[PDB]
Amino acid sequence: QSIIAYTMSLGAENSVAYSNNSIAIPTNFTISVTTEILPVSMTKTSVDC
Amino acid sequence: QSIIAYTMSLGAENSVAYSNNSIAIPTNFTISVTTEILPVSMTKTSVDCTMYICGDSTECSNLLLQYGSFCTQLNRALTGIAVEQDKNTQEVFAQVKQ
Amino acid sequence: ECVLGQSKRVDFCGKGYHLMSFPQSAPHGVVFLHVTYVPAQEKNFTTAPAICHDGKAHFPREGVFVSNGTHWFVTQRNFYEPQIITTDNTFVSGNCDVVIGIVNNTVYDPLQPELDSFKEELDKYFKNHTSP
Amino acid sequence: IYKTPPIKDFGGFNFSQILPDPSKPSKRSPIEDLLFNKVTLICAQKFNGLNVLPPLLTDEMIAQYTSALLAGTITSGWTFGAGPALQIPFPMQMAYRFNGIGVTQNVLYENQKLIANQFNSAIGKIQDSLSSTPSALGKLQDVVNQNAQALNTLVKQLSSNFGAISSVLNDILSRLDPPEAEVQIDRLITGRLQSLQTYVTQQLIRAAEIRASANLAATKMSECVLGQSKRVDFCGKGYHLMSFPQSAPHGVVFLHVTYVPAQEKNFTTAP
Amino acid sequence: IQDSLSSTPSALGKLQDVVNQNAQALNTLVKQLSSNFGAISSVLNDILSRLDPPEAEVQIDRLITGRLQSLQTYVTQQLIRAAEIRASANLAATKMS
Amino acid sequence: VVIGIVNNTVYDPLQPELDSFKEELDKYFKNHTSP
Ligand SMILES: *[C@@H]1O[C@H](CO)[C@@H](O[C@@H]2O[C@H](CO)[C@@H](O[C@@H]3O[C@H](CO)[C@@H](O)[C@H](O)[C@@H]3O)[C@H](O)[C@H]2NC(C)=O)[C@H](O)[C@H]1NC(C)=O
Ligand SMILES: *[C@@H]1O[C@H](CO)[C@@H](O[C@@H]2O[C@H](CO)[C@@H](O[C@@H]3O[C@H](CO)[C@@H](O)[C@H](O)[C@@H]3O)[C@H](O)[C@H]2NC(C)=O)[C@H](O)[C@H]1NC(C)=O
Ligand SMILES: *[C@@H]1O[C@H](CO)[C@@H](O[C@@H]2O[C@H](CO)[C@@H](O[C@@H]3O[C@H](CO)[C@@H](O)[C@H](O)[C@@H]3O)[C@H](O)[C@H]2NC(C)=O)[C@H](O)[C@H]1NC(C)=O
Ligand SMILES: *[C@@H]1O[C@H](CO)[C@@H](O[C@@H]2O[C@H](CO)[C@@H](O[C@@H]3O[C@H](CO)[C@@H](O)[C@H](O)[C@@H]3O)[C@H](O)[C@H]2NC(C)=O)[C@H](O)[C@H]1NC(C)=O
Ligand SMILES: *[C@@H]1O[C@H](CO)[C@@H](O[C@@H]2O[C@H](CO)[C@@H](O[C@@H]3O[C@H](CO)[C@@H](O)[C@H](O)[C@@H]3O)[C@H](O)[C@H]2NC(C)=O)[C@H](O)[C@H]1NC(C)=O
Ligand SMILES: *[C@@H]1O[C@H](CO)[C@@H](O[C@@H]2O[C@H](CO)[C@@H](O[C@@H]3O[C@H](CO)[C@@H](O)[C@H](O)[C@@H]3O)[C@H](O)[C@H]2NC(C)=O)[C@H](O)[C@H]1NC(C)=O
Ligand SMILES: *[C@@H]1O[C@H](CO)[C@@H](O[C@@H]2O[C@H](CO)[C@@H](O)[C@H](O)[C@H]2NC(C)=O)[C@H](O)[C@H]1NC(C)=O
Numbered sequence A: 001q002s003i004i005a006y007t008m009s010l011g012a013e014n015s016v017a018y019s020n021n022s023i024a025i026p027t028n029f030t031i032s033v034t035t036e037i038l039p040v041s042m043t044k045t046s047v048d049c
Numbered sequence B: 001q002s003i004i005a006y007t008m009s010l011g012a013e014n015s016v017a018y019s020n021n022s023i024a025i026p027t028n029f030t031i032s033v034t035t036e037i038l039p040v041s042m043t044k045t046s047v048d049c050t051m052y053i054c055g056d057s058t059e060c061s062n063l064l065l066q067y068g069s070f071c072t073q074l075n076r077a078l079t080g081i082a083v084e085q086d087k088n089t090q091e092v093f094a095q096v097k098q
Numbered sequence C: 001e002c003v004l005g006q007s008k009r010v011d012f013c014g015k016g017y018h019l020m021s022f023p024q025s026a027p028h029g030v031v032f033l034h035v036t037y038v039p040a041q042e043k044n045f046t047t048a049p050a051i052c053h054d055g056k057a058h059f060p061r062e063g064v065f066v067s068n069g070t071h072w073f074v075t076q077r078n079f080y081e082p083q084i085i086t087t088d089n090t091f092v093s094g095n096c097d098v099v100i101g102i103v104n105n106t107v108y109d110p111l112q113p114e115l116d117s118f119k120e121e122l123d124k125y126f127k128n129h130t131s132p
Numbered sequence D: 001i002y003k004t005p006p007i008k009d010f011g012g013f014n015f016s017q018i019l020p021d022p023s024k025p026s027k028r029s030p031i032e033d034l035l036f037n038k039v040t041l042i043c044a045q046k047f048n049g050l051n052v053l054p055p056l057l058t059d060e061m062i063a064q065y066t067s068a069l070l071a072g073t074i075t076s077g078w079t080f081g082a083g084p085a086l087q088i089p090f091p092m093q094m095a096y097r098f099n100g101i102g103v104t105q106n107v108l109y110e111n112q113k114l115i116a117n118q119f120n121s122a123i124g125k126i127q128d129s130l131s132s133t134p135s136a137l138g139k140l141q142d143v144v145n146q147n148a149q150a151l152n153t154l155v156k157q158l159s160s161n162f163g164a165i166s167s168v169l170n171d172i173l174s175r176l177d178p179p180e181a182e183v184q185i186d187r188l189i190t191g192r193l194q195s196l197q198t199y200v201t202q203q204l205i206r207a208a209e210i211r212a213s214a215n216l217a218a219t220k221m222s223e224c225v226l227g228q229s230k231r232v233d234f235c236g237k238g239y240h241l242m243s244f245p246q247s248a249p250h251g252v253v254f255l256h257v258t259y260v261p262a263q264e265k266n267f268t269t270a271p
Numbered sequence E: 001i002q003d004s005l006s007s008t009p010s011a012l013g014k015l016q017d018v019v020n021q022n023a024q025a026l027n028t029l030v031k032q033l034s035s036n037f038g039a040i041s042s043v044l045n046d047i048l049s050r051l052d053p054p055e056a057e058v059q060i061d062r063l064i065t066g067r068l069q070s071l072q073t074y075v076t077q078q079l080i081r082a083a084e085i086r087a088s089a090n091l092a093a094t095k096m097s
Numbered sequence F: 001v002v003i004g005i006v007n008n009t010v011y012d013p014l015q016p017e018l019d020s021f022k023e024e025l026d027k028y029f030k031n032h033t034s035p
């Protein structure tokens, strides 16, 4: 185990085949549930000089 | 040639013909391209406290300690800004996964 | 919102109706190129809210009734392309005594010529078949 | 700039309450007039460097702009935003709006008189609604009150002495010799500079807040008046139909005309 | 979803800092009370009882200036953070609606 | 005028119904030939 430095990755390359006479259509689907968090209020305060 | 001060004009007045049994329809069309420009990031920055106010001296190194921890306070805010810039550009240009 | 999809919000992806867009980088900035669609030269016509033929009224499924002065047709809103007023273009609802400003004309069923031709063929067959 | 036609027949719809009044000496409508009447020590500010610079766009110009927008909306629907203005009778425009909601347009043609009467009565109510409560426009009086209070606080805080012998520097100048006074003037200068720093910071923050509000108002104007928005509870409450803008001192007022079902009957269903 | 909220602790980080930073700021204020601000000693009662009153006014003025400056700094910080939170809350309300 | 069109017959749903009706009518005509 050690610490390592490197140029980070941009992602995974995935080329897509393109043509002037062909199309792609799905056949199955799936349902997903995602979570997102939003702050709303901060703590009140008051000072006596 | 000289300079003139006058009252504003909002443009060319153009009324429209209105009736209860007539409309207008276009037959031809045009395709256009419009440019928009938006800022994203500002240059990161960092500042040293003692070396700026009294760099390369010794009496100031004694005097400043009396006042408090301003030099520790400022760097936290500047660090927050520095991280925020990276967060901004990551948010803008990383909407795609492959 | 203006790149990965097509947005209906007005002026949010360029003036006019929105079609698509492209991004471009710039020093500490982004430049968007919005490709959009705008209506060109126009001509005016004479309209009518509805039409009544058999005591009942017809309303367009999509589009509007138009008339150059002699006959009536159905048109898409943003492109002039007159079409003969058939059955499929309109739907009926109620009689024509309620709508204010209705106008008179005929409606031509697209399938009536088919059945009429079949009836004509039946008449021809009867004429041929009477003799034997 | 678009101009309303001299004739005002719109198939039973009445717009007198919002169009400009040629009779009044000012070119403004009644609602704008009530709002202008609704919203409302100085000779020390102009004697201590404090000043107010008059705005560029005078309010008559704003009224002209709003009248142009209203006339365009009335006589063009929404195509005057996307491109060339194309006229269309008002009844068919409302039919297209009802079709956009999701209700077939015949329902408008059958019940035109009812909808026209409801429209006129609903607009008639709002004049009384504004004239009754005096706290409706608090969001507009708030900014003026806060700005005046802050500036007056500055000119009041000018009075302190910041530890010097006297609160007015002319006293020290005419009371001691220079090389001793150069000590007392320093404290006054430092304190007053601190006061200016704080005031400017407060003003910057408030200006940022107002800019955010102005951008929201611009988006609302673009996406409500110039067209029709499917976003829920953005252009009014309920199902959105159309909108009308009006001016007001350092503000803007929106009247969203919206649609909502009233009576319900239940039945047995089958998928 | 349950597993995620029971496994990834940092997923709630956006709701943690809004607390922690707050506390940190306030704590700094209290520590600024221990500062000297260029006087004889930070304890007010000490110099109050250890000197005659024709010149201690200078010491008191020093302390007053320093403490008001620090407290004003804290107020400005709170104002800016409150503006940011207001923007976030408006976005959340729109997303809800 | 369109680019890339391809050849195929378009099925007309009314055509089989009219074919059945025509065949039934011609059956009835063949029945009526005797009288
Ligand atoms: C579309 O994708 C779904 C999700 O994979 C497919 O449903 C899945 O179908 C498989 C095979 O029919 C199921 O596996 C079976 O599980 C039962 C136990 O319930 C087991 O006894 C069988 O031997 C087999 O392993 C799988 O459970 C099921 N998914 C779920 C969530 O129930 C679906 O078939 C796909 N549709 C098409 C048209 O391909
Ligand atoms: C809709 O608008 C377009 C754009 O104006 C029209 O296309 C234009 O058609 C005219 C006449 O065919 C073209 O004029 C020609 O110009 C060439 C030189 O470029 C000249 O040598 C020819 O003798 C002729 O004058 C014009 O170029 C063409 N516009 C473009 C951009 O190619 C179109 O006809 C309009 N259609 C309708 C239905 O309104
Ligand atoms: C308004 O629209 C109507 C409908 O298109 C126009 O009437 C049409 O006019 C054309 C040209 O005059 C007719 O076509 C010609 O018909 C004659 C029949 O004598 C034939 O010999 C020609 O070879 C050619 O086909 C067309 O029949 C006629 N429409 C109908 C239903 O009869 C009318 O001209 C338009 N008016 C205006 C001011 O735009
Ligand atoms: C559209 O076509 C209809 C025919 O379906 C036209 O209706 C005709 O209207 C006239 C005058 O309104 C009728 O003459 C008078 O009608 C009244 C009753 O409305 C009757 O009491 C009088 O004795 C006299 O007959 C005419 O009879 C009527 N035709 C039919 C067949 O009922 C209509 O005028 C056309 N134009 C529109 C609706 O703009
Ligand atoms: C849908 O709702 C509207 C609005 O309430 C209904 O129209 C209103 O119906 C009431 C009674 O049913 C009317 O009140 C009566 O008005 C007459 C004068 O017109 C008055 O003499 C009576 O004493 C009573 O106050 C009300 O006027 C009427 N609204 C309008 C604009 O005429 C409508 O009936 C409802 N639709 C259905 C199918 O029930
Ligand atoms: C779809 O089918 C049509 C015909 O049903 C094809 O059009 C025909 O294309 C051929 C060329 O491959 C040509 O046929 C020739 O016609 C001339 C007369 O012009 C004749 O002398 C030759 O012996 C030969 O039959 C002609 O361009 C055209 N003919 C017709 C009647 O349309 C079309 O190419 C087919 N397209 C596809 C994608 O299958
Ligand atoms: C189309 O709209 C115009 C209104 O712009 C109608 O009237 C024309 O108005 C312009 C200017 O107001 C005049 O220069 C034209 O001479 C007018 N037209 C005529 C025929 O006099 C015009 O009538 C409308 N088109 C139709 C077919 O009614």
Ligand SMILES: *[C@@H]1O[C@H](CO)[C@@H](O[C@@H]2O[C@H](CO)[C@@H](O)[C@H](O)[C@H]2NC(C)=O)[C@H](O)[C@H]1NC(C)=O
Binding pocket: B020, B021, C100, C101
């Ligand atoms: C459109 O407006 C015109 C002008 O107001 C109307 O024409 C007149 O309508 C009244 C009552 O409908 C008749 O008494 C007049 O005789 C009409 N004028 C002429 C010259 O005949 C027209 O009816 C309106 N059309 C619609 C659909 O509202």
Ligand SMILES: *[C@@H]1O[C@H](CO)[C@@H](O[C@@H]2O[C@H](CO)[C@@H](O)[C@H](O)[C@H]2NC(C)=O)[C@H](O)[C@H]1NC(C)=O
Binding pocket: D008, D014, D015, D016
């Ligand atoms: C639109 O509504 C206004 C408001 O009532 C109408 O103004 C009335 O005008 C008549 C004269 O025609 C006066 O006697 C009334 O006192 C006015 N009402 C007021 C002042 O509240 C106006 O006539 C209406 N316009 C249409 C076309 O119906």
Ligand SMILES: *[C@@H]1O[C@H](CO)[C@@H](O[C@@H]2O[C@H](CO)[C@@H](O)[C@H](O)[C@H]2NC(C)=O)[C@H](O)[C@H]1NC(C)=O
Binding pocket: D266, D267
């Ligand atoms: C149809 O709707 C009515 C009300 O609009 C329902 O009436 C309910 O009746 C029960 C029993 O008296 C009450 O406890 C409820 O409070 C009533 N509903 C309301 C909204 O007050 C009725 O049950 C519904 N029936 C069907 C078949 O949908």
Ligand SMILES: *[C@@H]1O[C@H](CO)[C@@H](O[C@@H]2O[C@H](CO)[C@@H](O)[C@H](O)[C@H]2NC(C)=O)[C@H](O)[C@H]1NC(C)=O
Binding pocket: A020, A021, F003, F004
């Ligand atoms: C689509 O691409 C294909 C492949 O390049 C082409 O289709 C045919 O290409 C052959 C040459 O290989 C030509 O002889 C045919 O005429 C082409 N058919 C058609 C219908 O064009 C062509 O480049 C493209 N086809 C299009 C655009 O229709």
